[PDB]
């Protein structure tokens, strides 16, 4: 209404400040005490509302506070298609389709004068407890087969490949299995301070990432069968890629919507 069109009941948000009452983790917050983001101590110090234009800032920079498998600091949101778990995610057969509006608010440069890079959307994998049993992992974590950066004013698409395509079953479910693409822009330039929108659609052994519903990424191949073994979640935000000393970046989201039909 007076905020930004989010959906709180789904999704989590983790900050770069620690938690006092969990040393050496970020602070994070889910359904229903996310909604009370704007009056909560630390959290609103980093995801916060705008209420002259109606967006959700994220705020993000190096803090030295991370997650187990995440390396540089965060103000991002995870989602969460059942309000209240996390361990409910989706396949690439059941598919899904995110929206969102944003705009890169402000950033930092690097030492060498180029912005620093920043990671808006994602899509995440997470192995069952079935298959982390199978393989004896310590988590549940596996490859975020989609990223979405902000990166020297483009729009920037990173995916993941299995290395080998013979590899095993076993093999597959293991992170080292996956290595990066070679990265895609979108042709539209995107400067700092302007809205744009993404949207991201799932679908059995197909992903599509839509800038300004203008031009399409599609990824289709192989590597896209492969992935199907896994389930996932959607992520949006300020995953901030420096640890330079003094850089940030703040994003911001006007509207963000998640469909699972």
């Not at 982390?132 to 990166?151: E, S």
């Amino acid at each position: 209404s007076k905020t930004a069109k989010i959906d709180w009941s789904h999704w989590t948000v983790t900050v770069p400040e620690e938690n006092p009452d969990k040393p050496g983790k970020p602070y994070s917050l889910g359904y229903p005490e996310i909604l009370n983001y704007a009056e909560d101590k630390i959290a609103s110090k980093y995801m916060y509302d705008d209420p002259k234009d109606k967006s959700v800032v994220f705020y993000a920079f190096p803090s030295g506070v991370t997650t187990a498998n995440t390396h540089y600091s965060r103000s991002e949101l995870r989602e969460t298609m059942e309000t209240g778990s996390n361990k409910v995610n989706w396949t690439f057969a059941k598919g899904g389709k995110m929206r969102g509006t944003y705009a890169i608010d402000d950033i930092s440069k690097e030492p060498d004068g180029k912005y620093s890079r920043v990671i808006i959307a994602q899509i995440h994998g997470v192995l069952t407890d079935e298959q982390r049993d199978l393989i004896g992992q310590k988590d549940n974590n596996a490859p975020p087969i989609l990223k979405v950066y902000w990166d020297k004013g483009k729009i920037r698409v990173k995916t993941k490949v299995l290395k080998d395509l013979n590899a095993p079953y076993k093999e597959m479910l293991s992170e080292h299995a996956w290595g990066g693409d070679e990265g895609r822009n979108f042709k539209e330039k995107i400067d700092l301070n302007t809205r744009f929108t993404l949207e991201v659609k799932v679908s059995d052994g197909r992903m599509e990432v839509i800038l300004n519903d203008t031009e399409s990424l599609v990824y289709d191949d192989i590597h896209m069968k492969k992935w199907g073994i896994f389930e996932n979640y959607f992520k949006a935000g300020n995953y901030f890629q420096s640890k330079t000393p003094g850089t940030f970046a703040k994003v911001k989201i006007y509207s963000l919507q998640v469909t699972h039909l």
